[PDB]
Amino acid sequence: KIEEGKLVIWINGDKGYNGLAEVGKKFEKDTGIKVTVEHPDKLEEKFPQVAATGDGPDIIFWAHDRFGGYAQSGLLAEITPAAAFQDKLYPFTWDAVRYNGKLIAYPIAVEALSLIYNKDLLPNPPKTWEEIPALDKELKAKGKSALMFNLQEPYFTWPLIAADGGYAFKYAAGKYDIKDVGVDNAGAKAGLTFLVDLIKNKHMNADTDYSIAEHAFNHGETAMTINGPWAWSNIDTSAVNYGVTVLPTFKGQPSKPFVGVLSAGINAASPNKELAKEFLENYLLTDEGLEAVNKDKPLGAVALKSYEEELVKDPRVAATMENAQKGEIMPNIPQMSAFWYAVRTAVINAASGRQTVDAALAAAQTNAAATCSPELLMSLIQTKCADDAMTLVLKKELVAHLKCTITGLTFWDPSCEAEDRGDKFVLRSAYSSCGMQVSASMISNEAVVNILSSSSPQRKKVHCLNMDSLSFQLGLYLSPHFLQASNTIEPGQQSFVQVRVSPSVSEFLLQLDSCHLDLGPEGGTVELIQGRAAKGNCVSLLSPSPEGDPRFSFLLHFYTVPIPKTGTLSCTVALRPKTGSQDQEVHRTVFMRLNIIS
Numbered sequence: 205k206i207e208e209g210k211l212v213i214w215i216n217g218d219k220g221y222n223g224l225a226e227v228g229k230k231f232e233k234d235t236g237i238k239v240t241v242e243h244p245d246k247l248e249e250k251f252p253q254v255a256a257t258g259d260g261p262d263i264i265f266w267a268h269d270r271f272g273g274y275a276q277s278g279l280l281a282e283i284t285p286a287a288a289f290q291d292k293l294y295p296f297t298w299d300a301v302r303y304n305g306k307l308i309a310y311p312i313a314v315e316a317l318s319l320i321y322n323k324d325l326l327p328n329p330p331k332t333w334e335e336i337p338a339l340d341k342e343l344k345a346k347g348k349s350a351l352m353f354n355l356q357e358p359y360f361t362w363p364l365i366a367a368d369g370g371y372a373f374k375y376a377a378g379k380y381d382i383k384d385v386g387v388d389n390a391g392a393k394a395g396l397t398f399l400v401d402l403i404k405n406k407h408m409n410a411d412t413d414y415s416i417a418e419h420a421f422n423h424g425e426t427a428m429t430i431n432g433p434w435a436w437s438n439i440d441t442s443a444v445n446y447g448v449t450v451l452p453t454f455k456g457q458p459s460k461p462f463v464g465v466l467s468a469g470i471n472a473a474s475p476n477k478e479l480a481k482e483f484l485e486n487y488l489l490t491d492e493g494l495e496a497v498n499k500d501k502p503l504g505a506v507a508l509k510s511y512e513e514e515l516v517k518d519p520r521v522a523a524t525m526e527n528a529q530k531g532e533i534m535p536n537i538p539q540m541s542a543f544w545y546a547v548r549t550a551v552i553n554a555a556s557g558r559q560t561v562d563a564a565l566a567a568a569q570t571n572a573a574a575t576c577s578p579e580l581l582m583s584l585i586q587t588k589c590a591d592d593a594m595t596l597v598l599k600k601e602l603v604a605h606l607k608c609t610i611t612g613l614t615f616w617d618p619s620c621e622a623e624d625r626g627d628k629f630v631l632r633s634a635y636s637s638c639g640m641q642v643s644a645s646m647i648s649n650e651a652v653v654n655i656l657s658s659s660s661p662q663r664k665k666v667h668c669l670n671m672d673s674l675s676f677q678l679g680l681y682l683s684p685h686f687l688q689a690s691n692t693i694e695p696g697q698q699s700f701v702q703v704r705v706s707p708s709v710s711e712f713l714l715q716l717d718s719c720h721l722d723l724g725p726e727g728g729t730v731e732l733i734q735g736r737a738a739k740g741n742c743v744s745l746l747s748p749s750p751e752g753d754p755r756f757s758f759l760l761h762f763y764t765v766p767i768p769k770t771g772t773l774s775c776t777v778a779l780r781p782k783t784g785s786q787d788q789e790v791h792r793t794v795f796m797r798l799n800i801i802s
């Protein structure tokens with residue numbers, strides 16, 4: 205699923221991703237968190253397909269209308285901005301991203317279509333739609349056209365459809381009524397008919413799309429176009445001398461564009477939600493962050509109050525707000541996708557001439573209304589830590605409960621593959637083999653699991669303790685207190701032993717499996733500890749040090765003389781991770797030579 209530790213962003217290609225990536229770069233320097241900005245095609249329709257399966261970006265940028273459908277499906281995570289932060293943005297933007305009383309996304313910018321015109325060609329654009337035919341006429345004699353804009357997305361045709369009273373859904377009793385659809389109303393039929401009449405009269409071409417309309421205006425083929433703020437950049441790359449003004453009226457009524465609020469939602473499956481929040485609130489939403497995106501591609505009106513006040517001075521931004529006020533914010537209801545899909549058809553079918561305006565719009569109103577559980581799998585993988593080797597074991601029975609078929613299990617080195625013993629899957633590697641990593645006094649690798657259900661590999665971090673890195677020493681103390689002389693031992697006097705390891709391992713639990721004192725030939729061997737417990741009345745276990753160092757006490761009695769001159773204390777220590785099971789427990793033996801005297 206989503207990669208843990210990194211932020212993946214999806215945004216439409218027309219919007220500045222480069223300016224956004226430059227915001228992420230600033231985020232990397234301070235927090236060292238790499239931000240990947242991508243712009244796939246059909247990210248709005250692609251996101252819900254992948255997100256439902258757990259795959260997708262950590263953050264998605266789109267108009268607000270799509271986020272309610274995502275929300276109602278459970279693909280978005282409710283954002284939790286502080287009241288002090290919400291006041292920094294205009295209240296109406298928070299209304300766009302509010303769903304079921306929850307905030308499902310962060311509003312970024314307010315987007316509304318405007319009329320862009322060529323000043324060199326047309327210093328004073330027409331005030332109304334009705335006079336475009338008379339305009340286009342004057343231009344065609346010069347080998348040009350009055351207006352070109354994308355007819356394949358109803359977003360661009362809606363301003364004319366809603367000018368006479370066309371509407372997607374009526375708002376009553378505080379909610380959008382999905383049974384009541386305004387596509388077939390005479391206001392829409394009047395707008396769409398006007399569009400068709402422009403195509404029939406040759407004033408526009410039905411096949412026109414976005415990239416053709418953008419190429420035509422920037423290259424001087426047409427005097428006017430309808431687009432959003434994002435497009436002003438490429439017009440600047442071009443030398444076109446242009447201006448942004450309010451959309452022309454229709455039947456005396458202003459053109460009502462559907463106003464989207466560019467918003468950043470957080471994936472419901474993303475583990476990084478905290479990072480997404482820290483990035484969006486602290487960095488992306490700011491005077492600087494928004495300016496960085498605006499330099500690459502214009503955002504137009506912004507949700508942030510402070511930065512907005514500066515942007516409103518821009519004539520182009522003032523023109524976008526003027527068009528927004530005359531427009532209606534898009535409903536965020538899940539039904540919008542069916543509405544948009546249905547309206548796109550009617551515009552294309554009616555503009556193509558395949559259907560009459562009444563027949564096309566009437567049909568649109570009808571359509572508008574309209575097992576593996578691999579996360580558990582990794583838990584079954586057991587890490588066995590031997591002295592020289594690490595072995596991974598996966599019980600077959602447990603796998604059966606999960607209903608998964610494992611295609612492969614390996615270490616980092618693909619050469620090392622698990623072997624099937626028929627009751628379990630075992631994978632053994634030497635600490636120096638299979639790309640094992642020796643660091644931090646630990647031997648770490650990853651178990652790469654491939655399941656038939658998912659193409660992507662599953663990775664689980666495995667670790668074993670490296671005892672060669674650790675240094676073991678045997679202390680001996682005359683009293684139950686720290687003392688500097690461990691070398692000499694005396695009979696009949698209590699002796700206290702402490703096992704010290706450097707670098708001290710606090711994470712691991714220390715226990716003494718066995719201890720022995722070897723008096724050599726003729727002296728015999730005395731068993732101080734066995735079976736993890738003290739042996740005999742002369743030995744008793746003590747409490748460990750503040751450090752993990754274990755401790756025990758023993759009393760040494762000799763009946764006869766000569767006393768053994770020298771002896772060696774042997775103690776076998778067991779090391780288990782506080783976070784690990786017994787499988788990962790490792791054992792080492794420590795020896796020390798000591799002088800016995802009396």
Ligand SMILES: OC[C@H]1O[C@H](O[C@H]2[C@H](O)[C@@H](O)[C@@H](O)O[C@@H]2CO)[C@H](O)[C@@H](O)[C@@H]1O
Pocket residue numbers: 216218248266267268269270315357358359360464544
């Ligand atoms: O055309 C239907 C389409 O309209 C909106 O998409 C806009 C978007 O709001 C703008 O920010 C920009 O990306 O242009 C898009 C049109 O291609 C809706 O947001 C979208 O759901 C809908 O399909």
